[PDB]
Amino acid sequence: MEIYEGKLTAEGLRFGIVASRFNHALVDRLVEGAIDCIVRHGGREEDITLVRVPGSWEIPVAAGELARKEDIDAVIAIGVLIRGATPHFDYIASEVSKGLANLSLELRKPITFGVITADTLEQAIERAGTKHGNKGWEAALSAIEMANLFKSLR
Amino acid sequence: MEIYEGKLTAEGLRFGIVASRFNHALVDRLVEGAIDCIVRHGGREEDITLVRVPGSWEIPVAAGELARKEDIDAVIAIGVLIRGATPHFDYIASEVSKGLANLSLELRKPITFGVITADTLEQAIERAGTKHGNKGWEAALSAIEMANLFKSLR
Amino acid sequence: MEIYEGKLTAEGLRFGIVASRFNHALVDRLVEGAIDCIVRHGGREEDITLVRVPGSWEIPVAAGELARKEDIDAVIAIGVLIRGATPHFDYIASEVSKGLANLSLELRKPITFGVITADTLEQAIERAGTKHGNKGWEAALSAIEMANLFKSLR
Amino acid sequence: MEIYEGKLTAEGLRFGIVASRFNHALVDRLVEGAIDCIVRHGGREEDITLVRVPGSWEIPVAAGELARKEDIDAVIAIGVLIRGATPHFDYIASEVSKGLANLSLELRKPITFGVITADTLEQAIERAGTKHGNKGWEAALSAIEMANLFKSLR
Amino acid sequence: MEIYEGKLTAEGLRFGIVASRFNHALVDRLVEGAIDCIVRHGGREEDITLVRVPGSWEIPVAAGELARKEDIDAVIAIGVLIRGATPHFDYIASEVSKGLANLSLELRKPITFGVITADTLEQAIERAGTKHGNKGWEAALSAIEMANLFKSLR
Amino acid sequence: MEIYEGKLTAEGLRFGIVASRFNHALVDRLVEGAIDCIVRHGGREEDITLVRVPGSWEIPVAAGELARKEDIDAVIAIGVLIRGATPHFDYIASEVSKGLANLSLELRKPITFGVITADTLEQAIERAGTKHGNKGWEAALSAIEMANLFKSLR
Amino acid sequence: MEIYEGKLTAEGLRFGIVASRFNHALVDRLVEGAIDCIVRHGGREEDITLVRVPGSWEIPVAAGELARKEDIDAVIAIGVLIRGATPHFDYIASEVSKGLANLSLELRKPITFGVITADTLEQAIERAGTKHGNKGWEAALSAIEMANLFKSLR
């Protein structure tokens, strides 16, 4: 039986991070977590490209630009969505997730989904550094592992 | 009338399995079930490729890499999703299923959906070895049958 | 004004039927209804290709194989989905319907949706031969009418 | 500032109408409304192509055939969906709308959505000639306006 | 074992339709459905005799006149009865059905019962073109099938 | 398509009216309505035969005597039944209606059912000249139309 | 049978619009809708006369002045009435409607009633551009159609 799996060492890997600006206070914590993960797993900060976009709606189109660069091994998508009074939340989150997934399949490159979709502000605060750990860190781990995996798998 | 149907014999077939690492305790049981099915239906374990991915979100992109290998007859996707407090579960499960289906149609190769989507942990425990039988076994049977079917159908 | 419409005569038409094996007791009734419709509207049973697939998840990929055969005029998709305890039903039904629709648009060939999506077993029993008439018969009628329509429309 | 907008004059425009046969009593009223709109806005009835399809499921595939004809300026899709006891309504309406939208984007031609999606029969009766005006008329107006718009825009 | 059954082809068959005038709005839809069925199953409209009667009470006596013509193969009875405030509905529906059945047995000719007996107007609207399909179409199918059956059976 | 229908002109037609004597106050209004209809649609009063019978039970046997006269074109049956305390109402109304229908089928002559079957006196008052129009007038119209119809149909 | 009906083309027609000033915010939207309708149906804006009046009470007397001009084909009356605390609303709306109708009959010229009579402000907002479409547009369509109709009818 052949086993393919990725180590959690980030030596030599190049990363791209797309972070929305809306929900500024929490997206900053998520980005801090992602950079901390990449650096403390052996990666250099000089090998990280950070792209700032106004809202979550533009994360897919910015990730399309980063992910087609040859010198990028994986892309981390970071954003915070909190449900409001209107159904706007549903139609934004669905399109963001769908675009990211379609892009990842199209470009044959791991694009990791580190976007928080919370019903309440309190949940988003939990998932961005407090009791539940930040999805920035979780997404960075996923991206590192897939970047290592695809080196063997390709 | 022409009838096309697949036998349940796994002699000579090559399989690929993509298993997420999240929900480690149950995904291991699902993978055990899938391998047991393939082996006990006549297949060899040396003809199975196992790919481990961090979460369910990356199953489609890893299955895209396995399914384009010529020496793979079918791909079994294995993962466990349990609904949490946030609507994150919906946007993950929808994208995983949609990506797998689109990939299967695109590559003209059977990609079987052995992912558990449970509201509660108790349901997931039921569907992964206990009272309801493991979807790893069910997915392996589906993959074997489609692999045999496409030999006749093509 | 130009009117394009299809007659309900099945002389000379070739059909493909994809039927899942899950919910064996009801899918058999649906297939019986479809074949009865095709035969009693003038079609021959020697001009029908039947493909059996394990579950509803594989209906799109099998229909992709039948529908690209030149000697097939329309494809009838037959399956039964009954909602269970998990949200698995939603993610299966959505992908089956989406795959069938995308395939039909891509191949410019009518693929008729004769899949039962029931909340309860009692509804599925109603819609498969009992009080509400079988969707196998309804789907066969739709396929016959579109097959006749596209002869004029093309 | 450049303003692009379409007049509501139908002189010289060619139209295609796809109408399902299910819910016969109301689809006939919708088609009457659409033809009345086209004729009373200056269009000729000899410049209208009407295609009849069995159910709403086949509207996208028939619209694909009409919309690729060069001598068709816009396509009007007409159908009536009333929610039943099963979730079948959701999976039919979603696929019809998605197919129509994808087709319109693909063919760069306006395909107007004049399909009634009603929870109850009483609502469908309202929206097909009675208190709320028929979506056949509304869809015909939309198609006329886009047909005029694309002449300037292209 | 000898099997006698009728095909659903209407080539060469002659039909008679008796339609009441009461409930004008729905009987017209039922008659449209019946004629559409006969025409789209291969029959000609020149081979259909339509008899209009004031109320449902006179359908049996008019069907007695049509059914004794030699050049009529089957008779379709079309009418709409909606229960009112008085028990008049019972004594009308019972006599209509009894007369039609006795006439059919006496003349050894299929007389198909396409009369709607509804408790409420909403049910009658359902059964005459809307959600439940029109009994005009159902009765026309029954008449076609029996007309084909009696050719073999006699 | 051959259309048979009767005009509403009563020139030259001969009518027979059987009216019960029970419920004298309302049967008189019904008879007035019937005669008014026949006269104002062009018929002469000298061409009307009126037969008075004690109760509704004897209407069928008197109509048997009128309807076998050659110089009678149609027979109008007029009576009023109001439900009492005993089930007598059911067994009278059923037999009256059944006898009239059987007689009409036997003699191949239109016998129109203008009998009021009311649960309460207030309903019978409504249906005999007041808010709901008298069944004498309605029955006379039905008889005129069938008399004209059978001239063409025979 | 002679059919008289008006097309929806506004070429060459001259219009007069009387708009009250009370409920300034909504009357402006209604006037915008009316002018947009006239322009986009082929009419010129140079052929429109706009008269502003203080309240709805003066719309009839101003419409009397416009409608007697020879070079005016139809008059559109635009105003918004919202019920207050006093019965003043009833006595204003009744007189406005009565005056407009009497004027239209007297001058043999179409005067279209595009006045909103709302119980609540929320309804008036609905009917002036939002969910229910603006009565300015509806009234302009009515005026165009009657202006075309009277050309044939006179």
Residue numbers in the entry:
A (entry chain 4), B (entry chain I), C (entry chain F), D (entry chain Q), E (entry chain h), F (entry chain M), ...: 1 to 154
Manuscript excerpt for this entry:
The second mRNA vaccine candidate (LS-P2-VP8*) encodes a multimerization domain derived from Aquifex aeolicus lumazine synthase (LS)35 fused to P2-VP8*. LS from this hyperthermophilic bacterium naturally self-assembles into 60-mer icosahedral nanoparticles. LS-based approaches have successfully been employed in other vaccine studies to display antigens on the nanoparticle surface, thereby significantly improving the immunogenicity of the presented antigens. The success of these studies is likely due to the fact that multimerization of antigens on a nanoparticle surface favors the generation of potent, long-lived immunoprotection in germinal centers through clustering of B cell receptors for multiple and simultaneous binding to the antigen epitopes.
In order to characterize LS-P2-VP8* P nanoparticles translated from mRNA in cell culture, supernatants of cells transfected with LS-P2-VP8* P were purified by density gradient ultracentrifugation and analyzed by transmission electron microscopy (TEM). mRNA encoding lumazine synthase alone (LS only) was employed as control. The pooled gradient fractions were analyzed using negative stain EM, which showed a uniform distribution of spherical particles with hollow interiors. A cryo-EM structure of LS-P2-VP8* P nanoparticles was determined at 2.6 Å resolution (at 0.143 F.S.C cutoff). In the 2D class averages generated from the LS-P2-VP8* P nanoparticle dataset, image classes were observed that show diffuse, nonuniform density protruding from nanoparticle surface, which may correspond to the P2-VP8* portion. However, ordered density corresponding to P2-VP8* was not visible in the cryo-EM map. Only a short segment of unoccupied density in the cryo-EM map at the end of the C-terminus of LS was observed where the P2-VP8* moiety is expected to be present. Since LS and P2-VP8* are fused via a flexible protein linker, it seems likely that the P2-VP8* protein portion cannot be clearly visualized on the surface of the LS nanoparticle structure due to this flexibility. The 60-mer LS-P2-VP8* nanoparticle core is ~15 nm in diameter with ~2 nm distance between adjacent VP8* protein as measured between the positions of C-terminal LS residue from the cryo-EM structure. Our data indicate that the protein translated from an mRNA encoding an LS nanoparticle domain fused to P2-VP8* P is secreted in vitro and self-assembles into 60-mer nanoparticles.
